[PDB]
Amino acid sequence: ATRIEFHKHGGPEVLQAVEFTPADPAENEIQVENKAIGINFIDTYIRSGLYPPPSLPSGLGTEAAGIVSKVGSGVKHIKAGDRVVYAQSALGAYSSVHNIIADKAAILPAAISFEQAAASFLKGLTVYYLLRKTYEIKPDEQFLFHAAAGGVGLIACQWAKALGAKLIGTVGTAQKAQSALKAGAWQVINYREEDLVERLKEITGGKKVRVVYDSVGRDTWERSLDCLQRRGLMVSFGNSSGAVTGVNLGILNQKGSLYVTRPSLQGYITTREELTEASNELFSLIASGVIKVDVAEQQKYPLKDAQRAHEILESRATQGSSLLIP
Amino acid sequence: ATRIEFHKHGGPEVLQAVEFTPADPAENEIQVENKAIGINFIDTYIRSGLYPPPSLPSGLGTEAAGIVSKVGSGVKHIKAGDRVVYAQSALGAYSSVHNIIADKAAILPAAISFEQAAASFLKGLTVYYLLRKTYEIKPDEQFLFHAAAGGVGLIACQWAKALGAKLIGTVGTAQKAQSALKAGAWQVINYREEDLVERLKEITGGKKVRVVYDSVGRDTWERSLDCLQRRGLMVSFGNSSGAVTGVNLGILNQKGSLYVTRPSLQGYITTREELTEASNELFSLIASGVIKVDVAEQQKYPLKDAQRAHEILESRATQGSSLLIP
Ligand SMILES: NC(=O)C1=CN([C@@H]2O[C@H](COP(=O)(O)OP(=O)(O)OC[C@H]3O[C@@H](n4cnc5c(N)ncnc54)[C@H](OP(=O)(O)O)[C@@H]3O)[C@@H](O)[C@H]2O)C=CC1
Ligand SMILES: NC(=O)C1=CN([C@@H]2O[C@H](COP(=O)(O)OP(=O)(O)OC[C@H]3O[C@@H](n4cnc5c(N)ncnc54)[C@H](OP(=O)(O)O)[C@@H]3O)[C@@H](O)[C@H]2O)C=CC1
C-alpha cells in the first residue's frame, strides 16, 4: 500500500509517499481500501506543526471513503465488502489502506459515491453541528459566515438556504462571491476589497447579527466582534490565517458582553449514536440533491501529489472541496 | 456637599474628600441626597487606572440610596421626597448629593432601609442576571461560584439556595467557608489551601459542572476551565486578582469545546423596563427575608474614610458588603 508521511514539520515539501504493508485490524477496527481521500485545512495545521502529532514520523488525514477489506473480531455492525466513509480516524487516511475504529465509520448509502462522500463527510458533519447545535439557526435569520466559497463554506451556503436562512458570506475574490451566491448565500462581502463592518451594518439595517461563524481566525477577529449584537455569539472554528492569540477577555465586555466558543468536531460528534443521527441528516440532503458536493476535476489529485494539493489549498486558489485519489 | 475625588491613578491614598456645590439636575435627572453609598470592587479598577475614566480629576462610585431633593423638568416618574436606589449613575456616587439620570433610579419600597439597598442593589442586580439570564440555573443544579463570601458572593449563596440549586463556592479562609455555608452554599472549597480541580471532581463525583461563575480572573483562569464539562460555559465576570489576558482561543477547544463570556451589568440591564423587572425580583427577596443583606458594623465607614474602605476591601479581609455613610 502507499501512504503519505512526514518526518519533520514544515511546508508542503515535507510530505513524502512511502510504501508499506497494512497490518490487520485490532478487534474493534475495520480495514478499508481507500477509493477517495478528503483534504482538510486541519491537515496543514498538523503538517506545519501548529497541531503537533502524537509522534514523528507521522501519517496525515482522518477522512476517506472506500470498501471494507477486513474486519476485526469484535466488529459486529460492519462486514467485508461494505462501502463506508469516516471523518475521525487515527492520523493516516492519506493512504490506500487504513485501519479505523469501527464506531467512527458510517455505512454509505448506494446513492452516494466515494468521491461525494470524501468531499463532504468531515465538512458536512461540521456544518451540521455548527448550524444546528452550537447555535440553532432559524428561518429568515441573517448571520455571517466567513470564507463562504470554501470546502466547509459552500456546504454551509446550501444548508443555510435549505433551512430558509440568510447567510451573509465573506470571500476573497469576485469569482468566489459568484460561486457562493450560486450555492445559496443571501449576500456576500468581499473582505479583501470591502469594509466588512460597514457593509454588514448596511446589509442588516444597522441591526447587526446574533451569530458569526469565523474560520479565518487571526485576520478577522476584531472585525467579526464588531459585527455582533449585544450578547451575540462569536464562533471561532478555524485558524486559516492563523490562530487567535493574545486576547484580553475585557474585549468581550467592551464589544457588548459577547459569548465566544472555539469548537471542534470531537467536542460534538462523540458517540456512534451522534455520528449516526448527523450522517442520516447529511446523507439525506446530498441524495436528494439539496446539497451538491461534486468536485472540480482540477481539484482531484493523485495520492502521491499530496504536496501539490497542499500548496494549492494554502494559496487560497480553491473553491469547494479537494480530493486525493489512491 | 462632600465628594471623593482623585487627581491621579494609584492605590487607596490617591482618594480625597473635597467640598463642592451641587449643580441643579439636568432635564432628565433627579438630584439625590445620598443616605448610604455602595462600595463595589469596580471602584478600585477605576481608581487604579485599570478602567481609566473620561478624565482626571474624577469622582467615584455608581451606587447609592437616598431621598430625591430636586427633579428635572422632563422627569415624570420620580417626585421630590421619593426614596430611591441606583446602581448605574455617572461616576460620583461617593458623595452626599449626586445627580442621576432618572431612568437609572428605582423607587425603594418603605420596608427596605437605605443601608440594605446600598448594600445590595448593584450586587443583587448582578446575581439576578448571572443566574437568570447569562445562564439559567436549574433546581438541583451543581455549579461553581468563586469568592462566595464576598459582596456578590453572599447574595449568590442565598439566591442559589432560594432557587433550590447547589452552589459550590470557593473562599480564601476557613472563616469565609462557614459564612458561605450559612448563607446557603451547598459545599465550599478553600482555594488557597486545597486543590480546586481535584476537590471539584470529588464533590461532583467526577461529573464536573456545566457552568462556572468566576470573578477572580487571572489566578483561577486555567483551574476554572478544568472544572467544566464538555461544551460548558465559563462566565468571567470580574478581575479581582487581575484581568485575564494573553489567552489563545485554542484552549477552549482543548478543554472541551467550551463557551466563555465576559459580561457586565450594562450589557444586561439596559432599559427602565429591564431595571424594573430585576429590581422587583430583588426587592421581594429582601422584603421576604430570603436574601439578608445587613452589613457588619465594622464595614460601615464615614464617607471621608473612603481610603480605609478601599485598603480593607483590597486586603481580602471583608465578608459581604461594605457601605460609605455620608
Ligand atoms: N472546528 C471544526 O470542527 C472544523 C474547523 N474547520 C476549519 O474550517 C476552515 C475551512 O476548512 P476547509 O473547508 O478545509 O478549507 P477551505 O477550503 O475553506 O480553505 C480555506 C479558505 O479560507 C480562507 N482564508 C482566509 N485567509 C486565509 C489565509 N490567510 N490562508 C488560507 N486561507 C485563507 C480562503 O478563502 P478566501 O480566499 O475566500 O478568503 C481559503 O480558500 C479551516 O480554517 C479549518 O481548519 C474545518 C472543519 C471542522
Ligand atoms: N460583571 C459584572 O456585572 C460585575 C462584576 N463584579 C465583580 O465581581 C467581583 C466581586 O465584587 P464585590 O462583591 O464588590 O467584591 P468582594 O466583596 O467579593 O471582594 C472580592 C473578593 O475577591 C476575592 N479575591 C481573590 N483574589 C483576590 C485578590 N487577589 N484580591 C482581592 N480579592 C481577591 C477575595 O475573597 P477571598 O479572600 O475569599 O478570595 C475578595 O474578598 C469583583 O471582581 C467585581 O469586579 C461585581 C459586580 C458586577
Curated annotation (Swiss-Prot), chains A, B:
Q: Which domain of life is it from?
A: Bacteria
| Catalytic reaction(s) noted | 2 a quinone + NADPH + H(+) = 2 a 1,4-benzosemiquinone + NADP(+)
Q: Which InterPro entries match?
A: ADH-like_C (IPR013149), ADH-like_N (IPR013154), GroES-like_sf (IPR011032), NAD(P)-bd_dom_sf (IPR036291), PKS_ER (IPR020843), QOR-like (IPR047618), Quin_OxRdtase/zeta-crystal_CS (IPR002364)
Q: What class of enzyme is it?
A: oxidoreductase
The answer to whether keyword Cell membrane applies is no
Q: Where does NADP(+) bind?
A: 41-45, 129, 151-152, 172-176, 191, 215, 237-240, 263-265, 316
Which of UniProt's keywords are assigned here?
NADP, Oxidoreductase
The record's GO molecular-function terms, alphabetically, read: mRNA 3'-UTR AU-rich region binding; NADPH binding; NADPH:quinone reductase activity; protein homodimerization activity; zinc ion binding
Question: What does the record give as EC number?
Answer: 1.6.5.5
Provide the Gene Ontology terms for cellular component.
cytosol
Q: Is Transmembrane one of the keywords?
A: no
Q: Which Pfam families match?
A: ADH_N (PF08240), ADH_zinc_N (PF00107)
Tell me the PANTHER family matching this sequence: QUINONE OXIDOREDUCTASE PIG3-RELATED (PTHR48106), QUINONE OXIDOREDUCTASE-RELATED (PTHR48106:SF13)
The family note in this entry says: Belongs to the zinc-containing alcohol dehydrogenase family. Quinone oxidoreductase subfamily.
Recorded hits in NCBIfam families, A to Z, give: PRK10754.1
Q: Subunit info?
A: Homodimer.
Instruction: State what protein this is by name.
Output: Quinone oxidoreductase 1
Gene name tied to this protein:
qorA
